[PDB]
Structure formats: C-alpha cells, structure tokens
Design a protein around this nucleic acid. Structure first.
Ligand SMILES: [Mg+2]
Ligand SMILES: [Mg+2]
Ligand SMILES: [Mg+2]
Ligand SMILES: [Mg+2]
Ligand SMILES: [Mg+2]
Ligand SMILES: [Mg+2]
Ligand SMILES: [Mg+2]
Lengths: 146, 118, 53
RNA sequence: AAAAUGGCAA
RNA sequence: GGCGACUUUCUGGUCUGUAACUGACGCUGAUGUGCGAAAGCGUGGGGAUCAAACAGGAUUAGAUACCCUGGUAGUCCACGCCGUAAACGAUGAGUGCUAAGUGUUAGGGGGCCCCUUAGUGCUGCAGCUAACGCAUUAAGCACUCCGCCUGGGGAGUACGACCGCAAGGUUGAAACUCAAAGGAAUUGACGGGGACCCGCACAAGCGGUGGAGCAUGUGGUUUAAUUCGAAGCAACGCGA
RNA sequence: GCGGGGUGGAGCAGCCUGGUAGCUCGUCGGGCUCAUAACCCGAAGGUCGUCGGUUCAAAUCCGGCCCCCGCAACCA
RNA sequence: CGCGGGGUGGAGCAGCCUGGUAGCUCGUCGGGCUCAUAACCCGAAGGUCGUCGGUUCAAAUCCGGCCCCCGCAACCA
C-alpha cells in the first residue's frame, strides 16, 4: 500500500570533527529538540574518552561504532538472516550506543557515553554485546536463510 | 583398527521430514552416516538444504578417516536437501565418480495411505 | 546412471543428473503415489491432464 | 494452528 | 454394472465390403426372467497394503472429529445371499428427416488429396427452450410402443403383503399442517475466494495512554433536587 | 456392632509427623470484541462440622455431639 | 555380622578408573519470536563433587579413615 521509496535527508559535517556520524549521534542524543544539551554531552564525552584512551576521540569513536554495527540481522517473513543495509548498519550502531549509554549507571550522561564508546572499542561494551546477540540468532536461523 | 577403502558409495536419502546421508564401501557395508537430526537440526530445519549439506559434510569427514577418496552418490526420495548434499560431498573433498537416483517406483503395487483432509 | 565427466564440475554433473531425473519423471511418479486417490478420480485426473495437453 | 454465536418485525 | 502385465484354452458381441440366399421373418414390450458398483451377510480359505470400529498422542471451551502413531472386521479367493448407488448423459427404446467447420478410432473406394461407412469429441445454423442451453451423438421436426409425474411437509413413514439368514428391499397411505416448495437468470451484499491497487493499515522509527496525584466529562450510587440532551467507530474537556 | 470422612460457592490436597491453608473451577474488577463466548491481566473469598480437652501453640492430637458413608448383623 | 556397590546444582547423570581440565540433561529465571500458545532460539543462575585426613606439581579423581545408603549372604535363641 505504498507508492515507493522516499529520499533520505542529509546532515552537515560536525564542525568539531568534520564527520557526518558525529552529527547523527548528536541528533539521537537530543531529546525534545534540545540540540545544545546533546552537542554539549557528545563533545564533553569525546574529550573524556580521548583523555582516558590517550587516543584521538574520533579514532576511538570509529572503532566503537565498527564493533557495535551488525553485518547480519533476522527479520520475520520465520526469522531469516539478511544482510543489514549499509545506511541501516550505521543507524543501528549509533542507536545502540546511545541506548546502552543511558542504561549505564554513571551519574552524568557524558561519563556514560565516554565509558560506553571506550568499552565498545574494547568490544566489552553492552552495545557490542547487542551486536553479538543479533549475530547469534542470525547464525541460529542460517537454515532459514534460503 | 582403521578401515582402508578408497572407493565407496554414498547414499543420500532425502525426505520432507528429514535428510539422511550414509557413506558405504562398494560392497555396501556402512563406513559412516550422518543426519540433520543427529546434527541437532529439528522440525522444519531438518528438511532445509543447509541441514542436508551439514549432514553430508559430517558423514564425509568420517569417511575420509576410513580413507575413502572417491564416492558415488545415490539419491532417494523427493526431499529438497538432496541438491546441497551432493555439493557438500564434493566440498568435503570426496570425489564424486557418479550420481544416480534410486527412489523406488512401484509398478502399481500396494495401496498408498489416505490423503490428509486438512 | 549419470557419471561425472572427466574435468567437469560436480555441480554441472549434478545439473545433468537433474535433467536425467526430469526425463525419467521418477520423482513425479513418486509424488503421485504418495497418497491414495479413488479409481474414478485417477481417470478424471488423467482425462484432465490429456485436456491440459 | 485455532477461529463458536447473534429475539422477531420493519 | 464394468473391463488396463504377459501367455494359452474356451467363448459373446460389433463394424466395413459384396450382394449368395430367405422374403417383412419387424418395432416396443405389462406380467415375467436374468444381470447388476460399493458396503454388508453365510461357509471354507487367505492376510502383504490400506483401514470402519477400537486405543494412545495432539488440537480444542469441549473434540465421541479434522491431524499423528497403531489397529480389527473388511479390503483378496471360491461358492451362495443381498439387489441397492448423484446405478447420471439426472436425457427409455425403434425409425426417418433437417446447414456447415474441425479432431480422432476401425474400415471401404478413387485420384498427399478427395469420397464414403460405423463410432468417438469439439464448434456452430435452422429450429427449440423459462432460461441455462441442445443442435445429424437434438433437448429440432415426425410416427409406434413402454415406464413415469400432477404443490410442500407428514413420508418413502404407518399398516398389510411379498422377498431376505440378517441388514433390509419392493409395494406404499392417512389424520394433520402450510401458502407456499421450487427451476433459471439478474442486481447487490458477503466469503477463514482470487487478481490488481491505495491510506501512519502494517512494517521501519519517535513520543505517549493504561500505573501516581490532580483537572474535567461520563456511568453508577446518593439526594428535596443532584436540570435536560449526546451512547461502539461517528456519546463521554460533547450542546456549554 | 466396628471403621472412614466433614477444609473458600464446588470438587479435591494439607492431618500420619502441632507452628505453614494448596490446586482446579466459580466469583469480583480490568482488557479484547460490534456484542457475547473463549482467551488475557489483576484481586478477593475457608473462625478448617460443632462443643470440649491438651498444649506456649491445634485443620493437624485427644474426648463428646450432630451429619454423612462403608462393612457386619450369624447358629439354631 | 561379612562380601559387593554407590554417595556430584532442585534432581538425575560423567570426568574417578587411565590425578591437573566438576561436564551433561531436565527443573529454573530473564529475553527474542509466536496474534498467539506451545515449540524453538538467546542469555543468566544453581553442584567445589558424601565427609575428613594423607600423598602429590596438581586428587571430585588416588590412597586411607569415617558416615550414610543400597544389594546379597547370615538368617533353627
Ligand atoms: Mg438473526
Ligand atoms: Mg463386496
Ligand atoms: Mg488412520
Ligand atoms: Mg432407485
Ligand atoms: Mg460422425
Ligand atoms: Mg493514569
Ligand atoms: Mg468475555
């Protein structure tokens, strides 16, 4: 009951890091259209992760997202493992990162996010575990790949 | 303690419920066998070609221990996993000398079971 | 009996085997005799098949 | 897969 | 009714051609007399498969079903019995006549083609028909003979008879009751029918409601009165 | 005459061995549905037949009373 | 009274023998999916091995002690 696909919106590169993904991550953090708070949290978190890591914040962020993003996922049609769309893969990575950061018990969101991205780079992150869990069920339904 | 037969015949029986693969010597004595159920595939999965592939692989690996290098494929039943099973045998590295279909056809023999009214 | 040709792909030989099975129509015969059908029904289906041809 | 039923007149 | 491996023996019917012979010797057919799927019945035998009944398992609100695993009679043979099937072409038999096109089976005749005979299909005039349809394989047009019907239900029941080992079969009402039962076709609506398509319909997402307190509407209950109206979506921060 | 039982509205555990009320259904409130059924969610309801006894404490053990049930009721 | 056997998540059941390396299966518990239900799938928890000593690099593992349980003899106060 739908005519076809709709063109997706585009984001301007984040001024600090000149990265689209940083802009996208800000948007996911933002709540109630409060951009300033979201930008503040991400930039502060990036500074914190960089300090603790001793490596470029953008570098660790790249490593983190790579670990969180999943190659295969299962969709009911039975659940069938399917290749995740490249744009979808980025969406899932950023989504899990912020969600798992909120689950973390650090008092300040900026501390949570910085710990998560560092842990995600370590591959010990909870968002990375979510990827693992998504991959486990995909391997389980490999017979139903057809 | 170890068998040493180079040439054997692999019998693949494919049914909608399950697929069974057995590797035997030319004489017909079984060297090894594997099944979807044996590999832990259950329900719908047993029919799936992937399950049949895996069954063929497991049976082939054991056969290679028996020293089988060349194998002949014999196919029985209409199960979908037959195609994958034959490929899996060669993927395991067993040479397929020949492929034949042995599924039984009666010349108007015994009465079949009733049709399922559901 | 289909025999895999020398220096031929197993999948190619399997394709040839599949074609040979299709020619035999053995699978088709097995599927027909999976479930019993009433003798009158058999004749009707045969007649319908002839009409299809 | 399961999947019942619905006052009589107007 | 039925009849599907092959072989032999015994045996019935049909069709083409010819025109030897016979010379209307024909047609139908009450009553009779036989044959007659499957199931069933009796006696003796056999028993692989399948499978009423029966038993688990499952399903479900229940599941004396559907599905699954078993399983007895039966399914098979012989000889009796039963005598019915949507036993159907829901189309009695014999005969003659009335456009064509095309496929196929078994022939015959004459030049791959034509002609012709008996079947077996499809298509389609004239004509017929309530309509659907039928149409040289009539449901057209005619003649002979037989069977059968005359609203629905009660009821293929009751009684009686006959027949059957039995199951039952054949024959076959009435009192009473209703104003209708029906056939065909049309237009809608509908379908755990189909095809092609839409909508935040779903999916992919984001933020909520249902929980707390409070505001307001409504139901209910209460009251002298708690004014009346709104009531699934399309009443309920609605008239206000 | 001798045994058994009497537990939410119902049926049935707990009693042997004192401290502990369970299950299935029904019920009540909500959801689902056009509505009902089914289904789903949440909750309530039994002084344990009745009077006594014992015990720190009784459904639980012990003694009466009432109700209900089974068995026995024989020989001349 | 002797002989034989065993004691391992809530439970059953291996590694014991042939020391290093408590596995397996249900019962659980939370998720995913199922309209659903079930099933299936994913994650998590629960025995330090009957107990106590000895030996050993290291013992549930072996050797001992001890206890519990089971089976069989003993079953003519
Ligand atoms: Mg009605
Ligand atoms: Mg019969
Ligand atoms: Mg059956
Ligand atoms: Mg009749
Ligand atoms: Mg003709
Ligand atoms: Mg609220
Ligand atoms: Mg209801």
């Amino acid at each position: 009951p739908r005519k076809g696909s709709v063109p997706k919106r585009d984001v301007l590169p984040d001024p600090i890091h000149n990265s689209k993904l940083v802009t996208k991550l800000i948007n996911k953090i933002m709540l109630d259209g409060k951009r300033g708070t979201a930008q503040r949290i991400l930039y502060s978190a990036f500074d914190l992760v960089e300090q603790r890591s001793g490596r470029d914040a953008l570098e660790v962020f790249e490593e983190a997202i790579n670990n969180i993003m999943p190659v295969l996922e299962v969709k009911a049609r039975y659940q069938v493992p399917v290749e995740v769309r490249p744009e979808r893969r980025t969406t899932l990575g950023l989504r899990w990162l912020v969600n798992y950061a909120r689950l973390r018990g650090e008092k300040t969101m900026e501390d949570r996010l910085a710990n998560e991205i560092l842990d995600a780079a370590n591959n010990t992150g909870g968002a990375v575990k979510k990827r693992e869990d998504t991959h486990k069920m995909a391997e389980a339904n490999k017979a139903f790949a057809h | 303690v170890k068998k040493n037969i180079e040439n054997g015949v692999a019998h693949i029986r494919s049914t909608f419920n399950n697929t069974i693969v057995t590797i035997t010597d030319e004489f017909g004595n079984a060297l090894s066998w594997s099944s979807a159920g044996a590999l832990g595939f259950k329900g719908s999965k047993k029919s799936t070609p992937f399950a049949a592939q895996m069954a063929s692989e497991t049976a082939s690996k054991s056969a290679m221990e028996h020293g089988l290098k060349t194998v002949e494929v014999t196919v029985k039943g209409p199960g979908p996993g037959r195609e994958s099973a034959i490929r899996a045998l060669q993927s395991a590295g067993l040479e397929v000398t020949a492929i034949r279909d042995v599924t039984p056809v009666p010349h108007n023999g015994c009465r079949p079971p009733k049709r399922r009214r559901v | 009996k289909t025999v895999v040709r020398k220096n031929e792909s197993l999948e190619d030989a399997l394709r040839r085997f599949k074609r040979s099975v299709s020619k035999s129509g053995t699978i088709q015969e097995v599927r027909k005799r999976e479930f019993y059908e009433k003798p009158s029904v058999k004749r009707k289906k045969k007649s319908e098949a002839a009409r299809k041809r």
